[PDB]
Amino acid sequence: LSEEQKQEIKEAFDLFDTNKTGSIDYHELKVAMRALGFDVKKPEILELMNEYDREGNGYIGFDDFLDIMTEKIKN
Amino acid sequence: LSEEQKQEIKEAFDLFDTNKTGSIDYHELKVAMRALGFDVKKPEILELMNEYDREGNGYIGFDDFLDIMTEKIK
Amino acid sequence: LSEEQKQEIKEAFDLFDTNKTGSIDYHELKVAMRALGFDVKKPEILELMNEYDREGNGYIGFDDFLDIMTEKIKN
Ligand SMILES: [Ca+2]
Ligand SMILES: [Ca+2]
Ligand SMILES: [Ca+2]
Ligand SMILES: [Ca+2]
Ligand SMILES: [Ca+2]
Ligand SMILES: [Cl-]
Ligand SMILES: [Cl-]
């Protein structure tokens, strides 16, 4: 929630944001969460994708990723 | 451990310091060590808590976490 | 790979640079890659070591590690 914590979450997102877009696809969400210490598996990742991929293009934004990590850490 | 290494250990601790208490409980220690690349399981984590939770309240400080990562890395 | 992505890869290498050399051994490569979200196993790590430990002393450099992570993140 703090600025220091938000930057660290941003570092994990920017590491696997290949095409310099503001998005990550399924595989990049898995390694990003694992880079933050969460051993997420395929059923959990697909559940998160379908919850946040509103336009249905296979990508989620950073603010989507920020809210995911917010739910995981604060709980 | 150098200043650069200690800062990185500090970043992993501050990420899972949920209430800014300067302390982490069992679950927060587990994900923090895994955030540093160590796949730790429940028996090892409980053994670390029992070693460093001297007050017996279910929390350890950063200097407890710093010493844990010191022996795991060095 | 942007300059900020290379800094994050450098942080993972420097965390397990135990003796302040420019090298990591088998075990230090395993945890360094796992610190970046890749849960690699023994056969893959030994495969990467054999490819990049050209001198054959059980160590690889940062530029070896940077190239490994470049291939992993860019599929
Ligand atoms: Ca992308
Ligand atoms: Ca990590
Ligand atoms: Ca706490
Ligand atoms: Ca205590
Ligand atoms: Ca070394
Ligand atoms: Cl999980
Ligand atoms: Cl002790």
TrEMBL record, chains A, C:
Ca(2+) 2 binds at residue 35. Keywords: Calcium, Metal-binding, Repeat. Ca(2+) 3 binds at residues 53, 55. Coiled coil: none annotated. Ca(2+) 1 binds at residues 17, 19, 23, 28. GO terms for cellular component: myosin II complex. Residues 4-39, 40-75 form the EF-hand domain. The keyword Repeat applies. It comes from the Eukaryota. One of its GO terms (molecular function) is calcium ion binding. This is Centrin protein. It comes from Euplotoides octocarinatus. The chain holds residues 21 to 95 of 168 of the full protein.
Automatic annotation (TrEMBL), chain B:
Ca(2+) 2 binds at residue 35. Residues 4-39, 40-74 form the EF-hand domain. Ca(2+) 1 binds at residues 17, 19, 23, 28. It comes from the Eukaryota. Ca(2+) 3 binds at residues 53, 55. This is Centrin protein. It comes from Euplotoides octocarinatus (Freshwater ciliate). The chain holds residues 21 to 94 of 168 of the full protein.
